[PDB]
């Protein structure tokens, strides 16, 4: 952290404070003054002309200004070698993640008129000419193409950024090689754990930020779509029933998976430990010629076997929970809309848009849990690096 970023304990807290201040100045009483003096209107299109409209251009300028002020403050406070990759690069990565979230929002918004047109066409044969079906696709290819470009550039920057992190660590570690040569495993912390830590931490930060942005972006969409769903099944009418039910279902699924999966990281760590002990005994037997006796290896492999079998048994409960949640899903977004379908309050486009919102929020949570899967590995790498650097400090 100290090798790549500026003073990190202050750095991340100041970044969060500045982000909160900027959000409170923008998404509140004073973020519309720029549009008032510029003439940004507010009726953004549904095609790919949103991303260079006056509102989006104004937001881009505001983000550039805020990041410039933050970067200037951190450049004058304490200059750093990698200050153009840790401060500006991270800001660019966050902005591109937000831009991809907004591209997804644009596609979700486009799903409504397209499926309204599909319903109109299927209502009566040859009521809708095929040309009106091409233009709609001509709209989607306008948006998706942008998501084709930026994302490709994003994966290009992130990787490079990640590699710089390694350099920032590596150029430090090999700068103290003489004072840090004696520590066991030094040949692996500098080589492998460096890239592993950098890549995993960067990916996890992106995952967390992406999930937060997806929720923030798709809560208002669900709130404004809930005006067409005046009755949930069984329970009847509930104020803001659609968004409340979606949030409750998502957090209930995540909490259920967490509760059934609290012992899984512990069992994973236990089996890793016993397998490491097996490897250590094998290493001793490599040259001692009397250590890896049949009784010792038999006992060690029995321990490995039972510690794997326990994990295989608990993952069965976790799989039951996860698969049941994923199969009850995909018919839950429609389950909430069944009374609206019956009563004819929503069209095909609104139904598809709501289902897409639910699916994208669920996918964000699943990607977050995918990160939580390798949380154990990242914690192991960080503890290894901290122990490795501890004696030198």
């Amino acid at each position, epitope marked *: 952290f100290k090798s790549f970023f500026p003073k990190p304990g202050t750095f991340f807290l100041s970044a969060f404070v500045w982000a909160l201040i900027a959000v409170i100045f923008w998404q509140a009483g004073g973020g519309d003054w720029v549009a008032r003096i510029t003439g940004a209107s507010g009726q953004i299109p549904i095609s790919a002309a949103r991303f260079w409209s006056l509102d989006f251009l104004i937001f881009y300028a505001y983000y550039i200004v805020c990041v410039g002020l933050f970067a200037l403050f951190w450049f004058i406070y304490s200059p750093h070698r990698w200050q153009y990759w840790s401060i500006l690069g991270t800001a660019l990565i966050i902005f591109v993640t937000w831009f991809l979230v907004e591209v997804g929002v644009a596609v979700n918004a486009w799903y409504a008129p397209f499926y309204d047109l599909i319903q109109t066409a299927l209502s009566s044969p040859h009521k809708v000419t095929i040309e009106q079906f091409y233009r709609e696709v001509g709209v989607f290819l306008g948006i998706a193409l942008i998501a084709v470009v930026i994302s490709v550039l994003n994966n290009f920057f992130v990787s490079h950024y990640v590699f710089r992190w390694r350099t920032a660590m590596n150029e430090y570690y090999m700068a103290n090689w003489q004072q840090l040569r004696h520590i066991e495993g030094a040949a692996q912390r500098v080589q492998e754990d460096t890239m592993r830590f950098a890549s995993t931490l960067e990916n996890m930060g992106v995952s967390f930020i992406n999930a937060i942005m997806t929720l923030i972006a798709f809560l208002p969409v669900l709130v404004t779509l809930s*005006a*067409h769903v*005046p*009755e949930l099944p069984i329970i*009847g*009418h509930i*104020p803001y029933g659609l968004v409340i039910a979606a949030i409750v279902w998502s957090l209930m699924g995540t909490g259920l998976l967490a509760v059934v999966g609290i012992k899984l990281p512990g069992l994973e760590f236990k089996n890793q430990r016993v397998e490491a002990a097996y490897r250590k005994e094998l290493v001793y037997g490599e040259d001692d010629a009397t250590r890896a006796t049949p009784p010792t290896v038999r006992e060690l492999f029995s321990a490995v076997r039972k510690n794997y079998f326990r994990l295989y048994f608990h993952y069965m409960y976790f799989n039951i929970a996860r698969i049941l949640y994923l199969q009850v899903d995909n018919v839950f977004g429609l389950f909430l809309l069944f009374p609206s379908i019956v*009563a*004819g*309050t929503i069209t095909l486009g609104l139904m598809t848009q709501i289902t897409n919102v639910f699916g994208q929020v669920r996918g964000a949570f699943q990607y977050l849990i995918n990160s939580w899967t390798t949380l154990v590995e990242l914690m192991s790498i960080y503890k290894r690096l901290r122990s490795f650097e501890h004696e030198l400090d």
Partner: nanobody
Amino acid sequence: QVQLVESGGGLVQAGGSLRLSCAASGFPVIANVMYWYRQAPGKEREWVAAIDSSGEYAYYADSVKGRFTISRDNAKNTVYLQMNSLKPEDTAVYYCYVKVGSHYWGQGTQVTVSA
């Protein structure tokens, strides 16, 4: 059981206002959500508005949002629909719907609007 009688006939000039009623008789409807539908001439029935039991929350169709105002009075067991400036498109027959065990459709009322 529940019978819905709808007053407030139409035959009004374009760009005006009109109040529609759904006086319900029979089983109480204090704890139900009441819908207002419309049927265009030679077309299918369309959703127009929906109102909750308390009357606090009102939902409107995407084509009549900001022009129609649905309110509820749980003293005469009625739901009212106030219609602001009317386009010629709003020339249909308005029905009132409520589900109490089974569906309940009221008799339609002409709201004929001439441009």
